[PDB]
Amino acid sequence: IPQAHEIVIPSYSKWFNLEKIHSIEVQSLPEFFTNRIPSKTPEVYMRYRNFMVNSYRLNPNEYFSVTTARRNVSGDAAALFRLHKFLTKWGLINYQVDSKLLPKNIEPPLTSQYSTRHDAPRGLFPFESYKPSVQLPDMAKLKKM
Amino acid sequence: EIPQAHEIVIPSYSKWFNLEKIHSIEVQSLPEFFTNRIPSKTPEVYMRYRNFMVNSYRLNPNEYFSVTTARRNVSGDAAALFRLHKFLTKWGLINYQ
Amino acid sequence: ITNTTTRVIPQVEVGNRKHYLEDKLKVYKQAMNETSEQLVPIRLEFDQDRDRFFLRDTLLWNKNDKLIKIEDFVDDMLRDYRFEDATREQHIDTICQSIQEQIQEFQGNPYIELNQDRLGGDDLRIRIKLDIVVGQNQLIDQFEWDISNSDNCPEEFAESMCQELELPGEFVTAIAHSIREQVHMYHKSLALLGYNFDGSAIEDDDIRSRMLPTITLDDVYRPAAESKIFTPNLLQISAAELERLDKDLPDIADIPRTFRTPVPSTLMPGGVDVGPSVESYELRNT
Amino acid sequence: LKKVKILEQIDENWSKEDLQKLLKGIQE
Amino acid sequence: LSTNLISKISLLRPSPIVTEQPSAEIREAYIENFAKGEHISAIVPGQSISGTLELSAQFRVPRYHSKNSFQQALQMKAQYYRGLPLYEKNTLLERLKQLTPNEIKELEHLHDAVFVNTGLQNVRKVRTKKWKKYWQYKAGIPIGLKRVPNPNFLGNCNIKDFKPPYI
Amino acid sequence: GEINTALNTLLVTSADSNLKISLVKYPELLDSLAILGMNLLSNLSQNVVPYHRNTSDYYYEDQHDKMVDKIFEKVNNNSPAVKQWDLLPEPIRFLPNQF
Does B66 touch chain C (CB under 8 A)? Predict the structure, then answer.
């Protein structure tokens, strides 16, 4: 009945359940599961997961940022950043976004393919005389005689 | 990509300096990036800082690439960045011309 | 120049500074006894009154670093700011004593790092506000930051934010310095009131009102009018506002801004373009 | 005759076409 | 000269983008007095690019609820335009006849998270297009590619190419 | 070559008795001489040949995700230690060859 779109998950992340917590996430992100902090519960972690992934899936060619997250979900920013890195490593979010549209560092560009000359000191190279003769010697007189 | 718009000269004893490669003199001169004691000083961090400083000098070689701009543009403590910048300018390679 | 009358020239300097000669034994004596780092946020503010320089630069510094003499680093910094050689009646000693005081007050990451480390930390989420001016742009943004977690990396979050906003790079080293500043000025106010950092029992009135309440199931989405504060705004300001900003127990209510005097650098965003040019000219005219 | 078979130096880093282009380039 | 030899003879031998202070005399007078430690009359910012990243004076969190559609629900116990594709009239209406006001607060924030992500993506693209022209301008390249030259000029080195003796 | 042409240009100047080599103006030349003489004494008693080795001569040319990268070696097919070294080697005694 409702509209549907196309989503592409890589093959090694098929284990992801939108309504269940996987065993990978309890050994990757152990801060939500100590059952001692009341602000990091295993039921409020699903409210982060189903707000990151289920908002990225509505338009998969837009890079899901992290400033779009902590504007809304009102959690700790470092926990949302770690969860945003965890969901990007397994390719759940930010997968069908085209490369070169991903955010890149503002840095001076690469000077790797530059040609450099060298200041060599005075006595490094020897004095060279006797220009070598590239031309082959001719033996016409020897074979003529 | 930016085309080469300047003449670049490093001294002959700095022939070993090659990007994307870490020479033995860089290990024996700055050992704190290669003894795995602090997780914020890895050789990837060292390669990032060194490539940043060398790429940033070679855009305008007539300018003295100060320590303070390198400190203001990459995130790290001032002591290690100062030591890496003084090691780099010790071997030519930056502020040579 | 080598083609000369055979003198001995020891260490022809680049610019006006002698080359830094290392020790190479204290470097190995320090790099092998290298347990922790303990970065220190350092703030430098000076005015035209009571001082002559302005020098609004902010930097991190390793507290466990015993290699670099601090007066040598300050003397290198003043030469990098193109101060002329009368730079001792506008003392390097004043800046050196300010930096010497600011690393002595740094009590370190407390028992959240020293004695115990609960994996995941505590509920101590603080309201970080920042206000950064670079060139004619002003970044104003607030968020929440768990001060009770040891594996919270400020630099890895600052690079993440400047990745999304495409910020030049002064914001990379200003956001992380602001995090390191405000987290330390909350940790110091906690440690001076005897907090006993393992059992929480916060028990105060100025703090426990700055701390944020526990996120419930319902409060996992913030209200819409409350959302418009927690969003990064990069405002543009003109010359009048830029001139207005040019003049105007730790106090956790006075959160300072990060204006910086520009370094005399050609390429880098955030610095004035004085000095040697991009083109290589000399202009001998007739 | 005892001819020098120069194109039998085809060790895996180089190849016969590489040696041929090398000789033709040095002659060029 | 014979064509049996002519084919073999050549065979055997083949032979408004920056925001600095554009006056190049106030920047120098600023540093000439800055080394003394004095302010000046005019202002000088650091160099940058133009453009403002202005959020929250832009796309807001939408208002899908009424003025009392939550407290009354509390009493009764209850292709793309910007980032979302335009739905048909009949298909979306039965979809919004399915949902509950426990999920309206979810839907508002989901659509705001789409809007802010698109409004950051396009500005990020424009910002990369500006920085790629900043770095070319600050390095002597013009765009999009009696003077006396210094030794750090492209082609005016002092280290002349020494030739080998066989050449 | 950079070592030998430095050594010869030091030997000509130091024996000249008109050109002074003062270490007040530069005290790190002597440390380079002494560390070079240390490292040449080291590989002479062990008969190691420097300056023309067939080794690569280059070192390692190339968080909360290190456990994720550990199990990434599990669900794709579906902590390094510290180092210790010194600046200078053994004086030449306390070597197994030297008794």
Answer: yes
